[PDB]
Design a protein around this motif. Structure first.
Motif, short mmCIF file in Angstrom:
data_model
loop_
_atom_site.label_atom_id
_atom_site.label_comp_id
_atom_site.label_asym_id
_atom_site.label_seq_id
_atom_site.Cartn_x
_atom_site.Cartn_y
_atom_site.Cartn_z
N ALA B 93 -16.25 63.02 -1.31
CA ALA B 93 -17.66 62.84 -1.07
C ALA B 93 -18.37 62.57 -2.38
CB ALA B 93 -18.23 64.06 -0.40
N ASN B 95 -22.40 62.89 -3.55
CA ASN B 95 -23.69 63.42 -3.12
C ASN B 95 -24.83 62.57 -3.71
OD1 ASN B 95 -22.52 65.72 -1.62
ND2 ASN B 95 -21.81 66.33 -3.70
N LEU B 152 -25.65 61.19 1.63
CA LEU B 152 -24.22 60.88 1.79
C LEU B 152 -24.01 59.42 2.14
CD1 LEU B 152 -22.96 64.07 3.68
CD2 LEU B 152 -22.48 63.40 1.26
N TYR B 155 -20.44 57.91 1.82
CA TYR B 155 -19.63 58.70 2.75
C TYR B 155 -19.88 58.27 4.20
CZ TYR B 155 -17.41 63.09 4.38
OH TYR B 155 -16.62 64.05 4.98
N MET B 205 -25.90 74.99 5.90
CA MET B 205 -25.16 74.36 7.01
C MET B 205 -25.32 75.15 8.33
SD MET B 205 -21.59 73.77 4.82
CE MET B 205 -21.34 72.44 3.62
C1 LIG Z 1 -19.92 66.19 4.98
C2 LIG Z 1 -19.28 67.28 4.14
O1 LIG Z 1 -17.87 67.01 3.95
C3 LIG Z 1 -19.94 67.43 2.81
C4 LIG Z 1 -19.89 66.39 1.89
C5 LIG Z 1 -20.49 66.55 0.63
C6 LIG Z 1 -21.14 67.74 0.28
C7 LIG Z 1 -21.19 68.78 1.20
C8 LIG Z 1 -20.59 68.63 2.45
#
Ligand SMILES: C[C@@H](O)c1ccccc1
Ligand SMILES: NC(=O)C1=CN([C@@H]2O[C@H](COP(=O)(O)OP(=O)(O)OC[C@H]3O[C@@H](n4cnc5c(N)ncnc54)[C@H](O)[C@@H]3O)[C@@H](O)[C@H]2O)C=CC1
Ligand SMILES: NC(=O)C1=CN([C@@H]2O[C@H](COP(=O)(O)OP(=O)(O)OC[C@H]3O[C@@H](n4cnc5c(N)ncnc54)[C@H](O)[C@@H]3O)[C@@H](O)[C@H]2O)C=CC1
Ligand SMILES: NC(=O)C1=CN([C@@H]2O[C@H](COP(=O)(O)OP(=O)(O)OC[C@H]3O[C@@H](n4cnc5c(N)ncnc54)[C@H](O)[C@@H]3O)[C@@H](O)[C@H]2O)C=CC1
Ligand SMILES: NC(=O)C1=CN([C@@H]2O[C@H](COP(=O)(O)OP(=O)(O)OC[C@H]3O[C@@H](n4cnc5c(N)ncnc54)[C@H](O)[C@@H]3O)[C@@H](O)[C@H]2O)C=CC1
Ligand SMILES: C[C@@H](O)c1ccccc1
Ligand SMILES: C[C@@H](O)c1ccccc1
Ligand SMILES: C[C@@H](O)c1ccccc1
Ligand SMILES: [Mg+2]
Ligand SMILES: [Mg+2]
Lengths: 251, 251, 251, 251
Positions: B93, B95, B152, B155, B205
């Motif tokens: 990922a 950010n 994201l 992503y 979350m």
């Molecule tokens: C989508 C999940 O995998 C995520 C990606 C980056 C930072 C936190 C969480």
């Protein structure tokens, strides 16, 4: 083995086809099961074909019958203890376009496929919440909850309704910490004795323009996704659609 | 027990978190497993933590490394016999919003999350087809294949790509009678040591506006849907998305 | 200007809010319009506020009233010539979870939001097909046809039903070369006098966790997508969902 | 007339087919337009065929060329003032399954269809935000962002990527009050001279099992939805998919 240990399930329309296979695999995995059908003549035989009375019983009930739903939950709790799991599987079809659907046909189909699923879902939440059961409501749908069929107008209405109604219920249960999950299962074409009795039906369903696999599924294909959903293995799954369709909706 | 009898699986990024739990349950159900990671130091220890070399081994591989994919399939076939099952789980990922994504970030993320999944899917179809294996390719995705996250961007691109690319592959395999299914799995938030190391992350979350259940999931939540998909229980499921998200996408 | 030249539209629930704005823009673009409401007192005033009797008239009708639908089409054809365009906009809401919905509430909401849309769609296909009108049925839905709201159980059912029922109708019309398209429109939150009368409602709807734009929409936002759909500009669009929601469903 | 008053648009791949029709209708509605293509020979002629230099100009640019994107925005701002509207329309196709896609084919298609759309979207947000322009980014997609085609593997990847990447961008713009909307358009089959040059193609696309209308669309079908999206009429629409497909995805 043991994947549904301690679970107590109601499966509406559980005497035939998909519902019978769900019942069969549920019993195999340790669940106690009450199957239903509007008619009595098939029920006891269907139950005995799966297992003994300590495993599975029959209760005659038309899923459109609101007051009969409380009798059904009571009978199941009497036989097996508190209900943990509800599979709203009973449904019918009308082979008409929207244009050609009579109002009587509309009302009859919605009574079973929509009202019946609402009655079962509402009562199941009430009776299953806050008991530490790992409760699960599995609302049977079909590919016809995602895509149209020109010749299934009222059926499409019902399946789209159950699809999104189930998300509402899922969310409310999750937000209220009820320990009740709600999900939908979406079979494509499945071979049953009823399909076998319709000349040409399986072949038409098996054309690649319909089912990319080139053949229709079998009742156990839907049974196995239901086992997963009824089990604690799926404790984080709620408000979602589980599609088992041979690729029908992927094209 | 026995739900993956005879299966031979590759799980990329299988040394940690979700991929480790998939490996664990795969071994429990009778599969032989090769796990991967870009780094070697965790791998052998991760493998030994699950089982013995006859059950599970490690192969160092960066999923973005195209030629390394053939070495990986060869090593797995050497250890365990022909590969039946591929879980494309490795991912990273960034950010950043789309607006703030650097081109280097874009290319790095797409190399792992998109190119890597393409390389694995392409090779797996080639190596798994027409062998009567009941072959299954499980392309890991996430809620971010259905909905956007402002932070994201790349992503989201990768996860939307894998979602629909997997349907293409599913259809072609089904139409060619290859005996290879292709499906995607879409975890919502899952608790892992990595999340635990990010102060505030699990709590954020777990807000009801994010995950309706009010808590995040665990690695086994994703393991169990993968077992179902890798098994012959799901032989009629292809081209579909399996969501395990605590209700995130239902609202 | 002129984008709906020659069109003749029925808009149910056309005296207020979204339906009134659709009526207004329809008249501006050259359509003749019949608006409806269950009550008479607002109707004539609403019509006169938009235009003259040669542009727009009122017909009292409860969309749940099946026989009243034929009277409505007859009155419109008498005033303006054959109907080309139907906007099924009339709807109500019940603020209850599935769990807490009474059967009377269920039946009342489905009568307006589902039966009424079925009656209008069925009759509109019958009356509009094969006339070279460029006919268009626009079934009003909402974000609640895509996602659940824990406090809108029956409403979600109705909106999911209309979503997929409309696809069935679209397909049958397209396959029969009826010259009738069927599509759904999915408003998110829209500011109206009714919302204004609910203390706190707009603010709650405008939180970023609900509507990413940080504010709700206006009736003309839904009017303009309806103009596009009612016009021949959208002659290749059928069986589809048009979402105008400030980003609500994108997260 | 006047629906895009004051708007300044860039349309990539604007010299042919869909992009040319978008350019044509944009000019008709009052927008100034810069069209692009990788090749120069068609461009000036295409522009002159629509309007005069004060209405529409050509800029040679390959959408995969990152640095060329800043030159393109600069040239447009020089000609017409600040850019308000970007239509990322340039794309290519590879007619290969995932299994049969070469890596070179993969990288070439992703460079245009994915990287190019990312570069345009990223730069457009940067250059268009916070200027009170009513800015709109319209990312061209296709039915292949929703469903698979066994023979369009990389194309499916690209279209699924753009679909969800666009939602990320939409959300971030909405949350940051940037005055930039981002939406996707999803044509089904459209008749162009290129399709006309492929023997059998339109007929195959027009089979009812593919397009329920029994015929493919025309470039103006996509132009008109783009006008709506580029205009202030759609000021509440962001993060959404607009499908114009003759019913292809409804079945
Ligand atoms: C989508 C999940 O995998 C995520 C990606 C980056 C930072 C936190 C969480
Ligand atoms: N066979 C197929 O190709 C497909 C079936 N489905 C759906 O899956 C579900 C299960 O199908 P099957 O059990 O194979 O059906 P079946 O067609 O073999 O038999 C109908 C089932 O519904 C029950 N039933 C009908 N009306 C009822 C009522 N008022 N009350 C209680 N029970 C009633 C019967 O016990 C029976 O099990 C249904 O909801 C159906 O609509 C969906 C797609 C395809
Ligand atoms: N933790 C969470 O909340 C969520 C995770 N996911 C997704 O699920 C999948 C699995 O996550 P976890 O295994 O828990 O991840 P993790 O975050 O705990 O660790 C990352 C995993 O990917 C591997 N990895 C990273 N780059 C790699 C490369 N170039 N080659 C090979 N392996 C590589 C590592 O072995 C590791 O298992 C990923 O695809 C991820 O994007 C999706 C939504 C939420
Ligand atoms: N205001 C909002 O935030 C949202 C509205 N919607 C939906 O959009 C549509 C239009 O809303 P508005 O016209 O603004 O509604 P409104 O709330 O301002 O007024 C209700 C409308 O429906 C009509 N109506 C109610 N019951 C009826 C019946 N039995 N027969 C005929 N007409 C009836 C009235 O004329 C009135 O125009 C509805 O279908 C609604 O469910 C969807 C999402 C949000
Ligand atoms: N014709 C059809 O049936 C369908 C077309 N589409 C999609 O809609 C969009 C527009 O199609 P048309 O303009 O009709 O295409 P076209 O096939 O008639 O011509 C291709 C277009 O893309 C441009 N182009 C290709 N590579 C480029 C690059 N590297 N840089 C800049 N421009 C480039 C050209 O100017 C040309 O306008 C595309 O994104 C396409 O993938 C989607 C579904 C069906
Ligand atoms: C959708 C499936 O259950 C079906 C319904 C009616 C006739 C044939 C098949
Ligand atoms: C979905 C929207 O129309 C709404 C319904 C009930 C109460 C408030 C808002
Ligand atoms: C999807 C459409 O643009 C297409 C792509 C390749 C060949 C034919 C048609
Ligand atoms: Mg959401
Ligand atoms: Mg389809």
């Amino acid at each position: 083995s043991n994947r549904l240990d301690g679970k107590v399930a109601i499966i509406t329309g559980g005497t035939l086809g998909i519902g019978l296979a769900i019942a069969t695999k549920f019993v195999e995995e340790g669940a106690k099961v009450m199957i239903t059908d509007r008619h009595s003549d098939v029920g006891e035989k269907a139950a005995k074909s799966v297992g003994t009375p300590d495993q599975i019983q029959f209760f005659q009930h038309d899923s459109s019958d609101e007051d009969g739903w409380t009798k059904l939950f009571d009978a199941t709790e009497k036989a097996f203890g508190p209900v943990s799991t509800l599979v709203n599987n009973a449904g019918i079809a009308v082979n008409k376009s929207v244009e050609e659907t009579t109002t009587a046909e509309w009302r009859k189909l919605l009574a079973v496929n929509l009202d019946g699923v609402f009655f079962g879902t509402r009562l199941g939440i009430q009776r299953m919440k806050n008991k530490g059961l790992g409760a699960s409501i599995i609302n049977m749908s079909s590919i016809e909850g995602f895509v149209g069929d020109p010749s299934l107008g009222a059926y499409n209405a019902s399946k789209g309704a159950v699809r999104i109604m189930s998300k509402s219920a899922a969310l409310d249960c999750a937000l209220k910490d009820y320990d009740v999950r709600v999900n939908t299962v979406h079979p494509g074409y499945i071979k049953t004795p009823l399909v076998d009795d319709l000349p040409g039906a399986e072949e038409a369903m098996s054309q690649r323009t319909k089912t990319p696999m080139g053949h229709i599924g079998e009742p156990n294909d839907i049974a196995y996704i239901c086992v997963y959903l009824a089990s604690n293995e799926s404790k984080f799954a709620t408000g979602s659609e589980f599609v088992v369709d041979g690729g029908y909706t992927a094209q």
